[PDB]
Design a protein around this nucleic acid. Structure first.
Lengths: 145, 75, 185, 64, 187
RNA sequence: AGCGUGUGCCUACCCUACGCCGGCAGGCGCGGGUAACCCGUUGAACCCCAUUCGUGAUGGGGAUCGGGGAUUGCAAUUAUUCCCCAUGAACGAGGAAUUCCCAGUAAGUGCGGGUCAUAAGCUUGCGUUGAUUAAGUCCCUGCCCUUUGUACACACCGCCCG
RNA sequence: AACGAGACUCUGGCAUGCUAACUAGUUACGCGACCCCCGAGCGGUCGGCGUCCCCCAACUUCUUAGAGGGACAAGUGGCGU
């Protein structure tokens, strides 16, 4: 036990030091179940321990692996930003950087006024769905005059 | 609406109780240890395997969905 | 916690209750002057005449006045009825409940002293002073609210027993913050 | 005030009763005195020579 | 030698049925002793054929019920198996005596039929008494397990032990003592 | 496991073993079948045995939405279908009402056929695991037969009075 | 006297009896081959395992499908003008 610290702050977000290490770091945006397992496998960490049982140099090893996947031989087919449209790079985007990357994508579609950008602006379904009977969020209207 | 607050690791006030309570119970199982000590089921599973290797309890039965243990062959 | 002297209600008198569910034979209910204990009203006991819908006689979460028609002490079974209750008895039930809710709102707040770890402190603070202040008067029909009103005009009531300073001041304030408009009549 | 339990044996089935045919009507003989027989209504499936448990012996019922 | 069959682990000869109305409808001992509570028998084909089914198989059938569990009989045999092993540790007694006494205590003996909010009291037959007892104690085990770390094998053991002594902590005893209270008001 | 389908007769497409390349969808090579002969002993799902989680909208649930890669086609944007990383909604057994069902049945579970260049949350068949409750009644909604009354025959959703 | 009902047609469950199979199998051996010694007993005649392989061996239980067979309220006990 050692009565060690059981809440910790990692990338401007709070991790509970109380779940299994592979399910604690998925509190970061851009890190799902599948990616969190592969990062800890490259970092040489035992998956059996609770997240409050890592030492100070073990968390810095995990953080420096999450920010640079391609230098620790994580494959290109794993990553969430592929050939990024403005500069051609491959990377994983995390935390408040993922919010801004979506914010730039919706404005890029709106500025040229393509059909995607207009559907996102009017608040309608963007992909191929019908709209007669599903997604209702207004109020019932009466027939009376 | 309510919340439990079960522990993930022991402290001496509950670990000494784990070793003192062994003769009291006719039936020993991870769920009855969990609710009585305020312990998670994964810590209750781990604690009962240590007492077995210490020789303090008897395994009655094992299956994927249910283990059963009992007091050490008297009382 | 309990508001009164005794573990269970007595037969053929009126209690304040709150309704939790409705089924094929009756409605299931929690008594409020006791520690939320279970009892039930049978559908035959709701009215003297034909029922157009049940939902307008009873609905869940509303407070209600009923008589206790039977009790078994050992198993903890209580049967309730509404066909019996006259509107004077409903007014009397609301007076008993208001005189009890005010006393309990004092004692629950006075209990927030020392360690306050368990309901053992509530039951220990209910016993002695507040209990001996009205166990003597069950037949005349007073509650500890009247002893607290005597303790406001002369604290010698409080000085007669083992005492706490919240138990003095909170008791006085829950009368005086309402009694101070002793206006022209 | 209180009265004891009595046990009685079915000697004949007489027909079916109630709004939907729900209850069997039956003749029963008491097991403490072979001369005493009465008629009763029963909720479940019933067969000749079954034993019923009666919470009151003094009540008797015809066609509901 | 083959005249005694231990149901894997538990003897039938020492069992007793203490209500004379139910001795014909609770099938235990003799030709009703088997190794497992699982057969493919055609018990549905005639009205009273149901009474020849061993009582441990009737408990096993009634347990594979609630929608997501239909047809899953191999899972339901091991629930009964692990419940009987817990009953023997808690009580020190034969698990078949605990099941028989739980059935004798749980079946209601007066009930009221419906005629128009309006009801009339009637007697209950011994076949409907054993049918009602099984459904009540299976329901009691099923409702307690639904959001607890307790397994259904532990809840079925707790429910049978409380019913065998009539404690009124069980679901089956509270419901029996409700049905007979309501019917006593409809005489 | 069981029921089936297979080189399209204008009309131009079929079912696939084995070897090699790729995380995957997929690609190249080279054989059998016009079928009790080849795909095929049709290595199906639930179920069965062992592990991890611990009563938390949680490792339950997977809607909504960003970026990249294949395949059909003359053409895929108002996203054909398929693959990958990421995002992580309502929902804690459902008010007044109301449907279907009696034994290898209800319900659970997966597989063929149709439509098909591309493609089932539909429908029509097949096997597998397998209960609880009844052996009755005319109460509710209806049907058959007889006696009876009528101012109805557009036939009670009729006719008719101030 | 006529139509409907029923009969009728297809289908499910039984046949170690019949007919007879290299586009279906079994058993057995002339035998042949790989692996294990666990087996009375050796590394064997003899044992175990096989969708490992020939028969110019014997056969039809398991598969296919043609002909016939079988069930009638026929037997025994009650109830019914």
């Amino acid at each position: 036990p050692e009565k060690f610290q059981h809440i910790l702050r990692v990338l401007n977000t709070n991790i509970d030091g109380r779940r299994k290490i592979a399910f604690a770091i998925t509190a970061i945006k851009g890190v799902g179940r599948r990616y969190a397992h592969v990062v800890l496998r490259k970092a040489d960490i035992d998956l059996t321990k609770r997240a409050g049982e890592l030492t100070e140099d073990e968390v810095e090893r995990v953080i420096t692996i999450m920010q640079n996947p391609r230098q620790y031989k994580i494959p290109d087919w794993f990553l969430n930003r592929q050939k990024d449209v403005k500069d051609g790079k491959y990377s994983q985007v995390l935390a408040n950087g993922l919010d801004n990357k979506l914010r730039e994508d919706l404005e890029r579609l709106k500025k040229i006024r393509a059909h995607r950008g207009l559907r996102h602006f009017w608040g309608l379904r963007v992909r191929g769905q019908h709209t007669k009977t599903t997604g209702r969020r207004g109020r019932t209207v009466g027939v009376s005059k | 609406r309510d919340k439990l607050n079960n522990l993930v690791l022991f402290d001496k006030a509950t670990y000494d109780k784990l070793c003192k309570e062994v003769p009291n119970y006719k039936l020993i199982t991870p769920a009855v240890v969990s609710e009585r000590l305020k312990i998670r089921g994964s810590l209750a599973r781990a604690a009962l395997q240590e007492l077995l290797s210490k020789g303090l309890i008897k395994l009655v039965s094992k299956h994927r969905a249910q283990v059963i243990y009992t007091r050490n062959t008297k009382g | 916690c309990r508001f009164y002297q005794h573990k269970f209600p007595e037969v053929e008198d009126v209690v304040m209750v709150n309704v939790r569910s409705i089924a094929e034979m009756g409605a299931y209910v929690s008594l409020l002057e006791y520690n939320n204990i279970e009892g039930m009203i049978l559908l035959s006991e709701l009215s003297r005449r034909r029922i157009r819908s049940i939902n307008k006689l009873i609905r869940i979460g509303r407070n209600e006045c009923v008589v206790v028609i039977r009790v078994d002490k050992e198993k903890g079974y209580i049967d309730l009825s509404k066909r019996r209750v006259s509107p004077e008895e409903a007014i009397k039930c609301e007076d008993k409940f208001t005189k009890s809710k005010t006393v309990y709102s004092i004692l629950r707040h006075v209990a927030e002293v020392l360690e306050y770890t368990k309901d053992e402190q509530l039951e220990s603070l209910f016993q002695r002073t507040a209990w001996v202040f009205d166990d003597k008067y069950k037949r005349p029909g007073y509650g500890a609210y009247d002893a607290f009103k005597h303790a406001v005009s002369d604290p010698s009531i409080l000085d007669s027993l083992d005492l706490n300073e919240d138990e003095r001041e909170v008791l006085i304030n829950n009368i005086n913050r309402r009694l101070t408009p002793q206006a022209v009549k | 005030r209180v009265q004891p339990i009595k046990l009685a044996r079915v000697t004949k089935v007489l027909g079916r009763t109630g709004s939907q045919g729900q209850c069997t009507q039956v003749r029963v003989e008491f097991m403490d005195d072979t001369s005493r027989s009465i008629i009763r209504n029963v909720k479940g499936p019933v067969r000749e020579g079954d034993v019923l448990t009666l919470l009151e012996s003094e009540r008797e019922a015809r066609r509901l | 030698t083959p005249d005694i069959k231990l149901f894997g682990k538990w003897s039938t000869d020492d069992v007793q049925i203490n209500d004379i109305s139910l001795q014909d409808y609770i099938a235990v001992k003799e030709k009703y002793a088997k190794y497992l509570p699982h057969s493919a028998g055609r018990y549905a084909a005639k009205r009273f054929r149901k009474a020849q089914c061993p009582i441990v198989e009737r408990l096993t059938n009634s347990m594979m019920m609630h929608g997501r569990n239909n047809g899953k009989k191999l899972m339901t045999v091991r629930i009964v198996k692990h419940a009987f092993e817990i009953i023997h540790l808690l009580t020190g007694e034969n698990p078949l005596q605990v099941l028989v006494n739980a059935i004798i205590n749980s079946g209601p003996r007066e009930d009221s039929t419906r005629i128009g909010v309006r009801r009339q009291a009637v007697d209950v037959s011994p076949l409907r008494r054993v049918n009602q007892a099984i459904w009540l104690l299976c329901t009691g085990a099923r409702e307690a397990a639904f959001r607890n770390i307790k397994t259904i094998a532990e809840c079925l053991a707790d429910e049978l032990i409380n019913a065998a002594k009539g404690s009124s902590n069980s679901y089956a005893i509270k419901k029996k003592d409700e049905l007979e209270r309501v019917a006593k008001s409809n005489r």
